[PDB]
Scaffold this active site. Structure first.
Site, PDB file in Angstrom:
ATOM      1  N   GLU A 123      52.858  41.271  32.596  1.00 22.07           N
ATOM      2  CA  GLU A 123      53.846  42.341  32.605  1.00 22.07           C
ATOM      3  C   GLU A 123      54.847  42.212  31.439  1.00 22.07           C
ATOM      4  N   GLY A 160      49.259  32.279  40.419  1.00 23.51           N
ATOM      5  CA  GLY A 160      48.753  33.589  40.026  1.00 23.51           C
ATOM      6  C   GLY A 160      49.847  34.573  39.629  1.00 23.51           C
ATOM      7  N   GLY A 190      57.263  49.501  33.014  1.00 21.70           N
ATOM      8  CA  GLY A 190      55.976  49.182  33.609  1.00 21.70           C
ATOM      9  C   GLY A 190      55.858  49.808  34.987  1.00 21.70           C
ATOM     10  N   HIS A 201      42.231  37.035  39.240  1.00 23.47           N
ATOM     11  CA  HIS A 201      42.313  35.606  38.925  1.00 23.47           C
ATOM     12  C   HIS A 201      40.922  34.972  38.987  1.00 23.47           C
ATOM     13  N   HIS A 202      40.331  34.695  37.822  1.00 24.49           N
ATOM     14  CA  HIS A 202      38.929  34.263  37.736  1.00 24.49           C
ATOM     15  C   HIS A 202      38.748  32.750  37.908  1.00 24.49           C
ATOM     16  N   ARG A 203      39.688  31.973  37.376  1.00 27.01           N
ATOM     17  CA  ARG A 203      39.508  30.530  37.200  1.00 27.01           C
ATOM     18  C   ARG A 203      40.854  29.850  37.344  1.00 27.01           C
ATOM     19  N   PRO A 204      40.907  28.706  38.050  1.00 26.83           N
ATOM     20  CA  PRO A 204      42.172  27.955  38.121  1.00 26.83           C
ATOM     21  C   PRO A 204      42.490  27.259  36.807  1.00 26.83           C
TER      22      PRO A 204
HETATM   23  C1  LIG Z   1      37.453  30.053  44.094  1.00 29.53           C
HETATM   24  C2  LIG Z   1      37.133  31.283  43.315  1.00 29.53           C
HETATM   25  C3  LIG Z   1      37.922  32.466  43.846  1.00 29.53           C
HETATM   26  C4  LIG Z   1      35.611  31.532  43.472  1.00 29.53           C
HETATM   27  O1  LIG Z   1      34.806  30.628  42.833  1.00 29.53           O
HETATM   28  P1  LIG Z   1      33.533  31.083  42.044  1.00 29.53           P
HETATM   29  O2  LIG Z   1      33.352  32.576  42.141  1.00 29.53           O
HETATM   30  O3  LIG Z   1      32.320  30.428  42.659  1.00 29.53           O
HETATM   31  O4  LIG Z   1      33.688  30.642  40.545  1.00 29.53           O
HETATM   32  P2  LIG Z   1      33.054  29.257  40.108  1.00 29.53           P
HETATM   33  O5  LIG Z   1      33.239  28.271  41.245  1.00 29.53           O
HETATM   34  O6  LIG Z   1      31.574  29.451  39.859  1.00 29.53           O
HETATM   35  O7  LIG Z   1      33.749  28.678  38.783  1.00 29.53           O
HETATM   36  C5  LIG Z   1      35.160  28.640  38.646  1.00 29.53           C
HETATM   37  C6  LIG Z   1      35.811  27.372  38.223  1.00 29.53           C
HETATM   38  O8  LIG Z   1      36.818  26.947  39.179  1.00 29.53           O
HETATM   39  C7  LIG Z   1      36.503  25.600  39.567  1.00 29.53           C
HETATM   40  N1  LIG Z   1      36.096  25.668  41.019  1.00 29.53           N
HETATM   41  C8  LIG Z   1      34.816  25.703  41.444  1.00 29.53           C
HETATM   42  N2  LIG Z   1      34.794  25.775  42.786  1.00 29.53           N
HETATM   43  C9  LIG Z   1      36.085  25.792  43.245  1.00 29.53           C
HETATM   44  C10 LIG Z   1      36.673  25.856  44.538  1.00 29.53           C
HETATM   45  N3  LIG Z   1      35.822  25.923  45.739  1.00 29.53           N
HETATM   46  N4  LIG Z   1      38.010  25.852  44.631  1.00 29.53           N
HETATM   47  C11 LIG Z   1      38.803  25.788  43.533  1.00 29.53           C
HETATM   48  N5  LIG Z   1      38.272  25.725  42.300  1.00 29.53           N
HETATM   49  C12 LIG Z   1      36.920  25.724  42.130  1.00 29.53           C
HETATM   50  C13 LIG Z   1      35.500  25.115  38.573  1.00 29.53           C
HETATM   51  O9  LIG Z   1      36.122  24.351  37.610  1.00 29.53           O
HETATM   52  C14 LIG Z   1      34.877  26.297  37.992  1.00 29.53           C
HETATM   53  O10 LIG Z   1      34.700  26.142  36.611  1.00 29.53           O
HETATM   54  P3  LIG Z   1      33.269  26.057  36.006  1.00 29.53           P
HETATM   55  O11 LIG Z   1      32.735  24.663  36.270  1.00 29.53           O
HETATM   56  O12 LIG Z   1      32.360  27.071  36.634  1.00 29.53           O
HETATM   57  O13 LIG Z   1      33.339  26.324  34.514  1.00 29.53           O
HETATM   58  C15 LIG Z   1      37.476  31.098  41.817  1.00 29.53           C
HETATM   59  O14 LIG Z   1      37.381  32.328  41.181  1.00 29.53           O
HETATM   60  C16 LIG Z   1      38.891  30.548  41.560  1.00 29.53           C
HETATM   61  O15 LIG Z   1      39.150  29.376  41.804  1.00 29.53           O
HETATM   62  N6  LIG Z   1      39.927  31.454  41.014  1.00 29.53           N
HETATM   63  C17 LIG Z   1      41.272  30.968  40.764  1.00 29.53           C
HETATM   64  C18 LIG Z   1      42.446  31.842  41.242  1.00 29.53           C
HETATM   65  C19 LIG Z   1      43.855  31.248  41.216  1.00 29.53           C
HETATM   66  O16 LIG Z   1      44.018  30.091  40.851  1.00 29.53           O
HETATM   67  N7  LIG Z   1      44.999  32.058  41.633  1.00 29.53           N
HETATM   68  C20 LIG Z   1      46.346  31.460  41.592  1.00 29.53           C
HETATM   69  C21 LIG Z   1      46.569  30.158  42.360  1.00 29.53           C
HETATM   70  S1  LIG Z   1      46.496  30.284  44.149  1.00 29.53           S
HETATM   71  C22 LIG Z   1      47.824  31.294  44.841  1.00 29.53           C
HETATM   72  C23 LIG Z   1      49.267  30.827  44.793  1.00 29.53           C
HETATM   73  O17 LIG Z   1      49.884  30.979  43.741  1.00 29.53           O
HETATM   74  C24 LIG Z   1      49.958  30.242  46.045  1.00 29.53           C
HETATM   75  C25 LIG Z   1      49.234  29.464  46.966  1.00 29.53           C
HETATM   76  C26 LIG Z   1      49.865  28.970  48.103  1.00 29.53           C
HETATM   77  C27 LIG Z   1      51.201  29.220  48.355  1.00 29.53           C
HETATM   78  O18 LIG Z   1      51.815  28.707  49.506  1.00 29.53           O
HETATM   79  C28 LIG Z   1      51.923  29.986  47.457  1.00 29.53           C
HETATM   80  C29 LIG Z   1      51.287  30.492  46.310  1.00 29.53           C
HETATM   81  O19 LIG Z   1      52.022  31.240  45.437  1.00 29.53           O
HETATM   82  C1  LIG Z   2      60.484  55.731  35.390  1.00 27.45           C
HETATM   83  C2  LIG Z   2      59.518  56.000  36.490  1.00 27.45           C
HETATM   84  C3  LIG Z   2      58.122  55.591  36.079  1.00 27.45           C
HETATM   85  C4  LIG Z   2      59.557  57.512  36.806  1.00 27.45           C
HETATM   86  O1  LIG Z   2      59.605  57.838  38.135  1.00 27.45           O
HETATM   87  P1  LIG Z   2      60.383  59.125  38.580  1.00 27.45           P
HETATM   88  O2  LIG Z   2      59.421  60.292  38.646  1.00 27.45           O
HETATM   89  O3  LIG Z   2      61.434  59.422  37.537  1.00 27.45           O
HETATM   90  O4  LIG Z   2      60.984  58.855  40.010  1.00 27.45           O
HETATM   91  P2  LIG Z   2      62.491  59.162  40.422  1.00 27.45           P
HETATM   92  O5  LIG Z   2      63.342  59.511  39.220  1.00 27.45           O
HETATM   93  O6  LIG Z   2      62.554  60.317  41.405  1.00 27.45           O
HETATM   94  O7  LIG Z   2      63.141  57.893  41.120  1.00 27.45           O
HETATM   95  C5  LIG Z   2      64.533  58.003  41.292  1.00 27.45           C
HETATM   96  C6  LIG Z   2      65.328  56.847  41.737  1.00 27.45           C
HETATM   97  O8  LIG Z   2      64.953  55.745  40.880  1.00 27.45           O
HETATM   98  C7  LIG Z   2      65.686  56.104  39.712  1.00 27.45           C
HETATM   99  N1  LIG Z   2      65.109  56.577  38.627  1.00 27.45           N
HETATM  100  C8  LIG Z   2      64.349  57.188  37.895  1.00 27.45           C
HETATM  101  N2  LIG Z   2      64.572  56.958  36.593  1.00 27.45           N
HETATM  102  C9  LIG Z   2      65.614  56.067  36.492  1.00 27.45           C
HETATM  103  C10 LIG Z   2      66.292  55.462  35.402  1.00 27.45           C
HETATM  104  N3  LIG Z   2      65.889  55.764  34.021  1.00 27.45           N
HETATM  105  N4  LIG Z   2      67.300  54.619  35.656  1.00 27.45           N
HETATM  106  C11 LIG Z   2      67.685  54.334  36.923  1.00 27.45           C
HETATM  107  N5  LIG Z   2      67.064  54.892  37.972  1.00 27.45           N
HETATM  108  C12 LIG Z   2      66.037  55.757  37.778  1.00 27.45           C
HETATM  109  C13 LIG Z   2      67.035  56.514  40.198  1.00 27.45           C
HETATM  110  O9  LIG Z   2      67.822  55.418  40.477  1.00 27.45           O
HETATM  111  C14 LIG Z   2      66.684  57.237  41.414  1.00 27.45           C
HETATM  112  O10 LIG Z   2      67.536  57.058  42.510  1.00 27.45           O
HETATM  113  P3  LIG Z   2      67.536  58.163  43.612  1.00 27.45           P
HETATM  114  O11 LIG Z   2      67.971  59.470  42.982  1.00 27.45           O
HETATM  115  O12 LIG Z   2      66.157  58.329  44.182  1.00 27.45           O
HETATM  116  O13 LIG Z   2      68.493  57.786  44.735  1.00 27.45           O
HETATM  117  C15 LIG Z   2      59.877  55.246  37.790  1.00 27.45           C
HETATM  118  O14 LIG Z   2      58.718  55.085  38.547  1.00 27.45           O
HETATM  119  C16 LIG Z   2      60.580  53.884  37.626  1.00 27.45           C
HETATM  120  O15 LIG Z   2      61.663  53.790  37.057  1.00 27.45           O
HETATM  121  N6  LIG Z   2      59.935  52.690  38.199  1.00 27.45           N
HETATM  122  C17 LIG Z   2      60.551  51.390  38.078  1.00 27.45           C
HETATM  123  C18 LIG Z   2      59.723  50.361  37.293  1.00 27.45           C
HETATM  124  C19 LIG Z   2      60.312  48.967  37.132  1.00 27.45           C
HETATM  125  O16 LIG Z   2      61.396  48.727  37.638  1.00 27.45           O
HETATM  126  N7  LIG Z   2      59.570  47.950  36.393  1.00 27.45           N
HETATM  127  C20 LIG Z   2      60.128  46.594  36.230  1.00 27.45           C
HETATM  128  C21 LIG Z   2      61.082  46.377  35.052  1.00 27.45           C
HETATM  129  S1  LIG Z   2      60.545  46.991  33.451  1.00 27.45           S
HETATM  130  C22 LIG Z   2      59.252  45.930  32.766  1.00 27.45           C
HETATM  131  C23 LIG Z   2      59.630  44.538  32.322  1.00 27.45           C
HETATM  132  O17 LIG Z   2      59.676  43.630  33.150  1.00 27.45           O
HETATM  133  C24 LIG Z   2      59.945  44.269  30.848  1.00 27.45           C
HETATM  134  C25 LIG Z   2      60.429  45.315  30.052  1.00 27.45           C
HETATM  135  C26 LIG Z   2      60.698  45.082  28.712  1.00 27.45           C
HETATM  136  C27 LIG Z   2      60.502  43.829  28.159  1.00 27.45           C
HETATM  137  O18 LIG Z   2      60.780  43.612  26.807  1.00 27.45           O
HETATM  138  C28 LIG Z   2      60.026  42.790  28.937  1.00 27.45           C
HETATM  139  C29 LIG Z   2      59.749  43.029  30.289  1.00 27.45           C
HETATM  140  O19 LIG Z   2      59.277  41.996  31.045  1.00 27.45           O
END
Ligand SMILES: CC(C)(COP(=O)(O)OP(=O)(O)OC[C@H]1O[C@@H](n2cnc3c(N)ncnc32)[C@H](O)[C@@H]1OP(=O)(O)O)[C@@H](O)C(=O)NCCC(=O)NCCSCC(=O)c1ccc(O)cc1O
Ligand SMILES: CC(C)(COP(=O)(O)OP(=O)(O)OC[C@H]1O[C@@H](n2cnc3c(N)ncnc32)[C@H](O)[C@@H]1OP(=O)(O)O)[C@@H](O)C(=O)NCCC(=O)NCCSCC(=O)c1ccc(O)cc1O
Lengths: 137, 137
Positions: free
Chosen positions: B63, B55, B82, B89-92
């Site tokens: 992001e 997930g 960001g 997460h709807h579906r695996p």
């Molecule tokens: C299980 C639900 C939450 C509810 O089910 P629902 O509301 O009844 O929905 P439906 O059943 O009606 O239909 C859905 C489809 O899914 C299939 N399936 C069916 N039954 C089951 C089942 N019992 N179990 C599983 N699958 C099932 C069927 O194919 C069905 O397809 P259809 O035939 O309908 O076309 C479901 O929404 C889901 O699996 N979401 C996925 C979220 C996800 O993968 N998150 C990230 C991964 S986990 C976190 C992780 O990263 C992590 C973990 C450990 C760790 O140590 C470290 C880590 O980081």
């Molecule tokens: C910018 C805000 C939204 C404004 O909040 P606010 O009202 O200004 O709050 P404050 O100013 O009071 O906070 C101050 C403290 O924090 C700092 N500070 C503030 N501005 C800066 C600065 N410019 N520089 C440095 N620091 C700053 C100061 O250090 C300060 O230190 P202190 O004085 O406290 O000791 C803020 O919440 C933020 O930077 N969140 C981090 C989000 C983040 O890391 N997202 C993930 C990564 S980006 C997405 C991505 O992954 C991505 C992007 C592109 C791509 O192509 C592909 C990708 O995947």
């Protein structure tokens, strides 16, 4: 403690095998009574194009932690899946490594909610996340 | 197009060098008038321990897209970051590739909101995401 499954850090870092967890340098660093922690590097594996920690990496760290924590809350015949994730990025991280701290918010029987806070190497909160999970069977 | 920046796929895929974007094997596949799209592998690099797509991988793709899209709406000097990410997460998914489609919901002067939908190969929606960004200054 809270956990239903009892696993060691070694065991936890062993499930990582050829997954995204390992792929991202994520290591489980602490398992307490009611808390799971992991660290993750801030280098080219987890960067975005400007050189800062990619927000997507903090997210993946949070889903990892919440899911594993969820897993250890299940009986022998159950699965846990992440269903809902959100994350707020407060501060950028340009260098070092980050620590994720995961704690329970709600431990239900069909679903749970987990808090994961991500700290930089100065212990400064940079990201707050919440993961909802589903318990199946 | 709507983008402030006129870039190309090649230009876009070049920014991925030495970042998490390249590490996850994400590649921008479509740059439309008002849509950005990238594909991402569902393999060991992006798996979770049950051999399903992690997930956090879908989150990272979302992001990535939202941020890149957001950059392309900035005049020179400005930066885009960001700030808020959510993801359902709807579906695996277990094999093949997934496709993230990023479109704008709201393009403001200091805040933007992007939608990212992630599809499997059958074209089924597997994950829905929303990314808030900040423009500065
Ligand atoms: C299980 C639900 C939450 C509810 O089910 P629902 O509301 O009844 O929905 P439906 O059943 O009606 O239909 C859905 C489809 O899914 C299939 N399936 C069916 N039954 C089951 C089942 N019992 N179990 C599983 N699958 C099932 C069927 O194919 C069905 O397809 P259809 O035939 O309908 O076309 C479901 O929404 C889901 O699996 N979401 C996925 C979220 C996800 O993968 N998150 C990230 C991964 S986990 C976190 C992780 O990263 C992590 C973990 C450990 C760790 O140590 C470290 C880590 O980081
Ligand atoms: C910018 C805000 C939204 C404004 O909040 P606010 O009202 O200004 O709050 P404050 O100013 O009071 O906070 C101050 C403290 O924090 C700092 N500070 C503030 N501005 C800066 C600065 N410019 N520089 C440095 N620091 C700053 C100061 O250090 C300060 O230190 P202190 O004085 O406290 O000791 C803020 O919440 C933020 O930077 N969140 C981090 C989000 C983040 O890391 N997202 C993930 C990564 S980006 C997405 C991505 O992954 C991505 C992007 C592109 C791509 O192509 C592909 C990708 O995947």
């Amino acid at each position: 403690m809270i956990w239903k499954r009892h696993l060691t850090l070694d065991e936890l870092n062993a499930t990582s095998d050829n997954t995204m967890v390992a792929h991202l340098g994520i290591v489980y660093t602490r398992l307490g009574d009611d808390v799971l922690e992991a660290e993750m590097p801030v280098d080219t594996r987890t960067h975005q194009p400007f050189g800062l920690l990619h927000g997507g990496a903090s997210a993946a760290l949070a889903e990892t932690l919440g899911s594993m924590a969820g897993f250890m809350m299940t009986r022998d015949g159950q699965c846990v899946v992440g269903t809902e994730l959100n994350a707020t990025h407060h501060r950028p991280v340009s260098e070092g490594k980050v620590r994720g701290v995961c704690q329970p918010l709600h431990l239900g029987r069909q679903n749970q909610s987990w808090e994961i806070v991500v700290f930089d190497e100065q212990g400064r909160r940079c990201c707050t996340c919440r993961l909802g999970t589903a318990v199946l069977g």
